[PDB]
Every structure is written in C-alpha cells, then in structure tokens.
Design a protein around this ligand. Structure first.
Ligand SMILES: [Cl-]
Ligand SMILES: [Cl-]
Ligand SMILES: [Cl-]
Ligand SMILES: [Cl-]
Ligand SMILES: [Cl-]
Ligand SMILES: [Cl-]
Ligand code: NA
Ligand code: NA
Lengths: 406, 408
C-alpha cells in the first residue's frame, strides 16, 4: 500500500515546476532517486532534503528534456541524458552526477556550453556553504577550451562543433549525498581543448595538477602515474577534484581504455607493477574473481564499432594524497551486455562472502524496484558499471552506475 | 535531541527563495507551522508536503516583508501581517489552518490600488497543485462583495485620497487553506466594507444578496431570512462572507458578524439568533459559553474602533453556517483573548479539555504553546493567542480553535 517512492509522490503534490523540461526531469529522475535514498538508510528528513534539493538546484540545469528526435545539446550520462545516478555499497550512499546545461547550448547561444556550470555553482554555494569553487577557477584554463585554443580550431572542427551532433561535455558535477552533508566533485574533460592544442589528455591533467599543487606535494605521485601512462601508451585522461578549500582537496586522474581484458585491467591496477602495497595485492585477487564471475565482455577497440552492441571501455582512477607515497587505484568494469539477474547473483554472493549480509538480502529486491515491471533476465543495459576499490581497514568499496531504461 | 521544527530546518537546507521577502516570510512562518503540524499528529510526509506547499504557493503572495516603518500595503492577519495560523482542537484531535490575503508588491507602489489581481494570480497557481479547488464561486461572488469599476466611480474625493496611500487597510479577500489529513480544502472570505463605503449598502445586505444570487434554487432562503431578521432586530450591519472553494452544489456558506459590544449577554443574544435557535446543541453550547467566558474573563473594551485598537482590544465575532437540508443555522462564537495572559488561557484550556473528555489535548496544551513561542514569558504575554472560537455538536462535542498573532 505505502510505495517505496512515497517521498517522490509527496513532493509531487507540493512542487510547482516553472517549465515542462524541469517537470519531465523531476518525473524521470525522482522516483528512482527516492527509492535509492530509502535503500541507503537515509533518514526521512534527509530523503526529503535531497529530493527537494535535486528539484531546486539540479533540475533547472538539466536542459531541455531530450525527447526522441529532439534537436538538443547531447550528453551520455545515464547512457543518453545530462544526469546519472550511482550507489556506493558499505548502509549505502547515493550520488547524482550531471552536466550543467541551459537551452542556449542547443540554439547557438553557448557553443561549448561554458556558462551553465558557473550559473549552477552560484546557486549551489547559496545552499551548501562548504562548497568551495576556487579549484573550478584555477583548473578551467588548463582543462577546457579557452578563447586562445578556439582560435586554433580548424574549419572542419568548427563546422563539426556548430551543430548538436557532437558530444561537447567539458564539465560534469557530482553531488555525493553523504549523511554528514553533501560533498561536490567536479570532473574536467580536456578532449575539446586537446582537439585544438594537440596536447594529450594526460599531459593536460598533470599540467593542471602541477599548476595548482603550489608546493609540489603531489609531484612524486604524478611522476609515478605519468611514467605508467607513457609505458602503457595511454593519453585519454580526465580529472576529478573535490570542491572544497584547495588545502583539503583530493585529485583523481581517470583513464578510459578500449581494450577490455583482465590482463589490461591488472596492468593499470598495479600501475605496471609500481603499486606494491598489501591492499592493492588483496584487491587484485578480488578483481580476478569478480571479472571471471561477471564475465566482462571484450568488445572492439574502434569507438564506433564498440558502440554497435553498446559496449563500454574499462576505466580506472588514481587518487592522490599528499602524505602517501603511492596513489590509490579504483577499477570500473563495464556491465553493458551482462543480464541484470546475473550481476545481482554475483553481487549477492560477493556481499555474503565479504560479511555484508544486509546488502546481499536486499540487492535483487531493490534493483527490481528501481526498474519496476522490467524483466531483469532480458535487460543488459540498466547496471552499466561496477567500480571497485579496496582497503584492509574498510574492506571492499563497490559502486553501481545506472543507465536510464530504453 | 531533534528539534520539534526539524522539517523547517531540513527544508531550509533545500529551498532557494528567489527574493528577500519570500525568504523572510519562510523564516517568520515555517518554524511555528512545522511545530503545529507535529502537534496535530500529521504524518511526516504531510508535514513536508504542507511546509513545501506553503513555500511554493503561499510565500510568493504574502507581498513585501512588512519590516518596521516600511511603506507597504497593510493587512491585520496575525495582528499586522498578510498571514495568520490557527489550530482546531476536538476529541478526534488537531488540524492547522493557514489564512492569508494574497498580495503582490504592485499594491504597495500604486499599480493595484484595491489589490484586485493577486487573488487571481494565487488561484491560478493553487489549482495546478490541488485539483479539488474550484473557483467558480470566486468568479460569481466577487461582483457582489467587492469594489467594481461602477462602485469606484461613486467614491468621493475624500474616500479616493484616503485609499490612494498604504495608510488604509483595503482587504477584500482572505484565502484560508484548511490542512486536513484527507487533503487541503480552500475557503474564501469576502469583505464588502470597501464596496459598501462606495454604494451605501450595509455589509449584511451585500452578503445575503450575494448568497441569493448564487443559490439558484433558493435552498438557503429560509436560513437567510432567519439570520437577516436577527441582524435587523439586534441592529447589526457589519457582515462578511466565507465559502468553500468546491463545486457550488457542494459549498457551505458562513455569514460572519463583528460586534464591538464585548459582553456575555450580547454574545448569548447572537449565539441563539435572538431566541430563534432552539435546538439542544445550541442550549448546551450556551451553557459551556457561559462557563468559558467567566473562567477566561473576556475583557469588555470600548465601543469606538480607534479607542478599542489603542488598548489592542478586539470585538466579539460569530459565524452562522448554512446547510440546504437543515432548518436552523449553526452558530460559532469568537471570543477575543488579547489582554488575557497566555498561561491563564492555557490553564483554562487544559481544565476545559480534562472536563470535556479531551485528555490528550489537556496533557500537551501548555508545552506546545510554549514551543510555538520558545523562550517567551507566557505569564507576561497577552497578545499571542488572540481568539478562541467555539462551536458544539452532541456527536463530536466541543469544537475549539485558537487564532495566533505574531510576537512583538
Ligand atoms: Cl568559493
Ligand atoms: Cl585552502
Ligand atoms: Cl565510487
Ligand atoms: Cl474552477
Ligand atoms: Cl456544482
Ligand atoms: Cl474554527
Ligand atoms: Na547490465
Ligand atoms: Na492572549
């Protein structure tokens, strides 16, 4: 009788959306978000807080609702939207990631979608005082297309970028819905800047960290990762930082790799053997088991051939901490093509084995409620990624990133 | 220890108000409203629903925040605001009501002299969220109870000059949102005072003429005649009307009267409609009123409105509810409480609840009142609980309501 998304149905009776697009994003996103907040054991107060904050802060920057065939600025979050939900398993914590965008980006009034992230932060900082954007100001120059870079783009690239055909994402904001309060993260995608300058994504990322790391506290950590990227031949990197006072920030360098094999994931996990710690060694054994049990699909190396069956690359991020001698790895395993019931079976057995019986018991039930009425045996594109990190202290750290149905 | 107003503190972290006035109305109103919703035993979901609805629908029509000395269109709800909270207490429990005069800044700067547009802007928003709200009666009753273009042409120089500034209270419409657990019911109050200043008609004649114009088959004719005769005999002209904003077939009309003569004998005379109300519920109500009036010690103020306002004293009021089937109107008495200490009211309320088989109400009355006015001395305060309304049925027992004024 009392639905799991009651908080969504309740706020629906009280929120007056100013336009059809915000209305459609609320109805598309809020039911699943409400369920994930119930599942994560957030208090009723915090469920209402986060749903209302989503409505007030996030829905106005999701852009025109991307109805089938609509000529709008495109994004790939959640598969084909400007918003993606993910959940971390430890209770659970939910995360909302989105590319801030306004309609002007679809109608020729913001070619490289530069203004929306700025409009978004100016609203976010009014509600979440702990959000500090000093790093947004410092990093933008190094990781995004500047006026000077744009003057270097050729006729073919400019015509290609003039339409809504190309994905032009440079910024993604993630709101980590912690029970102690929201922490915002900013992702910088140097792809467009690099198309103009000729620099690699990894060179842009390290140059940005160096420009920001004033006392060179991260230099040795950077050198270790750089050397691995040079040796393993990886250029396609992007950066993530916490939007807190620069003193207290954490940088994560991400890489995407089209070669989807356990051997390639292992090579990146250990940074070509440079990561010698006990925690990384235990983690790789757990990964070997997970990769095998899940049966991660090896797709084509060509990006256009890869998207034919809707396959994803592997990804990793390396977390940098001033004090530590070694970076901390995180592996993202692509799950598109694997039936949802298979993933649920492997996850349930994993939780049981790693002393998380409360997670194991509800995994399937909760997944089925997010995709109510959908056949989870037939579906292969709902749970898109599984991320894995490990510490002896806290145990396995697993996250699921969801794609919107159909 | 979680604060009683946790839902207010929670929504404060999530709502981005577009201007300073909406922000100030939220902070002024929402803490007490959140406490009242906890006290009325509303589910946590409904607490969030009603607080958010107040923020989304009500705060945009409360107008500029009336800071001390600010030259803005004035209203007397809650004493000196455009918003008032009230609570109902019964055997079945407690419900909250939010009453407000829809107003926009244009009414303060010469762009809406008699504040005509704001109620229309408000309803166009309300009807999008509460589908059961029907405004057919607003369209029908406005002409009969408010200043029309034709009436305005009949205002003299003195009247027009006096109404041009923000000095005069020009309230013609008040909307009340009754926060029932089964869902919101909206009520509309029409004050014919400005129309009557122009036409020379009495408020009661305007009210009955409005009911007649709307009651197509004359189902309320005999009920109206009974009340009208009492008003003629007892010499009362100052009336206003309330209706439920539902399909006109299902509506309920209440005719209100204000009387500056604050005596038990005058309240009794109105309660029985000069002896016309002979039912048992009216006789029982009369017994209870006599006791309550005495225990509270309702203050008899001056008959002159300005001399009454000086002492901060209020008149008595009554309403008469009309039902097509019923042979007799149903009375409700409003007893003014300004000038009576809050702890005295609480003591009388607590004892009344205990005798009249309302022990749950009796137990928390004082505690709840103290939390609404946290840190305030309730022995010294005399202007927080402003009115006590009383109605009675054998079936449901005493029906009591407290109408609150904003502190300081
Ligand atoms: Cl900042
Ligand atoms: Cl700092
Ligand atoms: Cl994660
Ligand atoms: Cl209507
Ligand atoms: Cl009808
Ligand atoms: Cl009442
Ligand atoms: Na899948
Ligand atoms: Na009082």
């Amino acid at each position: 009788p009392i639905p799991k998304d009651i908080a969504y149905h309740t706020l629906t009776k009280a929120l007056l959306f100013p336009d059809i697009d915000q209305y459609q994003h609320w109805h598309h996103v809020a039911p699943m978000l409400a369920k994930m907040l119930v599942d994560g054991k957030y208090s009723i107060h915090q469920q209402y807080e986060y749903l209302c904050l989503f409505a007030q802060l996030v829905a106005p920057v999701l852009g025109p609702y991307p109805s089938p065939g609509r000529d709008v600025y495109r994004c790939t979050l959640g598969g084909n939207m400007t918003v993606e939900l993910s959940q971390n398993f430890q209770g659970s914590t939910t995360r909302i990631a989105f590319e801030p965008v306004r309609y002007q980006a679809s109608v020729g009034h913001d070619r490289f979608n530069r203004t929306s992230v700025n409009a978004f932060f100016s609203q976010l900082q009014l509600l979440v005082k702990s959000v500090n954007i000093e790093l947004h100001h410092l990093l933008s120059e190094h990781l995004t297309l500047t006026a000077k870079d744009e003057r270097n783009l050729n006729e073919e690239q400019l015509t290609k970028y003039l339409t809504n055909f190309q994905v032009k994402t440079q910024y993604v904001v993630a709101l980590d819905l912690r029970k102690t309060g929201i922490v915002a993260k900013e992702y910088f995608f140097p792809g467009i800047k690099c198309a103009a300058t000729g620099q690699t994504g990894s060179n842009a990322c390290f140059g940005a960290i160096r420009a920001v790391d004033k006392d060179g506290h991260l230099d040795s950590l950077c050198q270790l990762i750089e050397a691995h990227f040079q040796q393993s031949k990886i250029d396609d990197a992007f950066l993530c930082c916490d939007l807190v006072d620069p003193a207290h920030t954490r940088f994560k360098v991400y890489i995407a790799d089209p070669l989807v094999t356990l051997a390639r994931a292992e090579e990146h996990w250990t940074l070509g053997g440079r990561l010698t710690d006990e925690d990384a060694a235990v983690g790789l054994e757990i990964i070997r088991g997970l990769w095998s049990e899940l049966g991660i699909i090896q797709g084509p190396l060509e990006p256009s051939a890869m998207m034919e069956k809707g396959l994803l690359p592997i990804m990793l991020n390396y977390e940098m901490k001033a004090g530590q001698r070694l970076p901390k790895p995180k592996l993202y395993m692509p799950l598109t093509g694997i039936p949802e019931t298979k993933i649920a079976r492997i996850m349930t057995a994993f939780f049981q084995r790693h002393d998380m019986p409360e997670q194991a018991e509800v995994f399937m039930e909760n997944l089925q409620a997010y995709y109510e009425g959908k056949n989870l045996e037939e579906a292969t594109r709902y749970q898109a990624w599984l991320s894995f990190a490990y510490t002896k202290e806290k145990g396995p750290y697993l996250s699921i990133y969801y794609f919107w149905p159909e």
